[model samples]
Target: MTIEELKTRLHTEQSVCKTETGIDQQKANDVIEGNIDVEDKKVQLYCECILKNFNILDKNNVFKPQGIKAVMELLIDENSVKQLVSDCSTISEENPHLKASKLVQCVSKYKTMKSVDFL
Candidate 1:
């Protein structure tokens, strides 16, 4: 589909999804629009995690600090990874070499498995 068509569909879907989910559809739309990188895998990872966490938080459920902090750290780290994919400058053309560098950076610099004090 053309970009215009895609955008129209996106607006429609965002409205429908937000209405059905009772969530912040505007912010969700912004996050998706901020994806200048079009990296589907990374964007999906970040958005899905954020959405799940936001839902959990919205439930007003109590959880341990460690659990919450861990999720936050994961959110930040993966967010960085996702943000990196947001542009051509951060990620070069689809060269295997450049992709490998990004992969290493993602794993080492953004290790979501561990809690980061200062990212």
Candidate 2:
């Protein structure tokens, strides 16, 4: 998908996940901006909800790095996407929610550094 299309998709999913997780817009934006603590339960749940909607995280709570990489490639270069997938895949958290949060954090940090503003 194009970056704008991806943003629209993310926005729609963000709205649904925010309501489902009871995360306010400010907090959700903070989370996306990598300002919120990933370990926070609410933040973790919000990440999981969004990833689940994107099918990057399954109902069984398994993370699909390939799925994530596919989306990232829409907005980031292949090398950066490779690095993100490599880094995020190494997060060994046993808790699925926390794992999702960490993955989100990793990607958010990369986006911040690159100034890739879709989100």
Candidate 3:
């Protein structure tokens, strides 16, 4: 399903974290204590959904250089930057989508366990 569809569907369902997406529930729980793993496309899009829920991504999917900067700005501690430096390096002017997705993943995995705290 597309991001737009995921948006509408979640209104009726409890959460995408408990079903559909392939993210590991154990790992999601581990994320609370600063543990994280960058999984596959399903998880990538799952992370996108988390960001969308948090308003980090706009309805039009307009997250961009600004979003990239936002994630980087949140990287105050060394561990924060270290954890995401690889994915961050993969981002560039030519690949804003990477920044957007990576930002969401970082947010869900590291910052707000609220999205997957129960996992």
Candidate 4:
């Protein structure tokens, strides 16, 4: 489903949810806190990309260069990406839908949890 659909669905499911496109501090807190549920949590980056690549961070899907730039920076930041995907993979043990998403799996996995040391 699309970002709009996710918003409508989430807002419908939880009255406290806000449907605005730009990623709010509140939503970020919600996602990190696991309050957004697995489906909505999985959909977040996709929704951000929509708000970005598709130009929907504001009304009429208009371009938000900074927002899109931030997302792009995130996509290109391989180290952070590794941790993020790793975090999700681990988090999925508790929230199964996270494990089922191909989009999330596409991220390259680095040594996120091995706890190794080097000199």
By lDDT, the best candidate is 2
lDDT string for model 3 (12-109, tens) is: 23265436456566654443333444444554555555556545567665554344344434433656656555454444434434444456555444
Quote model 2's TM-score: 0.88
Any idea what lDDT model 2 has?
Answer: 0.79
Compose the digit string of candidate 2's lDDT tens values, residues 1-119: 87667667777887888899988777788876677578788888898898898898889987788998888787778999998888888787888878888888888876641244534
Q: How many backbone clashes does candidate 2 have?
A: 0
Candidate 4, residues 28-84, lDDT tens digits: the string is: 444423344335653454333333333424554333334323332333465565454
Consecutive 10-residue window with the lowest summed lDDT within model 1: 110-119
TM-score of 3: 0.42
User: Per-prediction RMSD in angstroms?
Assistant: 16.7, 2.4, 9.1, 13.2
Against the true structure, what is each candidate's TM-score? 0.27, 0.88, 0.42, 0.22
User: Considering summed lDDT, which 10 consecutive residues are worst modelled in model 4?
Assistant: 110-119
Instruction: Report how far off residue 44 is in candidate 3 (Å).
Output: 0.3
Candidate 3 at residue 40, lDDT? 44
State how far residue 89 of model 3 sits from its true place (Å).
13
lDDT of 1 by residue, 8-118 (tens): 544554455455545454444434434212243343333334333434223332212343333334345555544533431233435433342233234333332212212
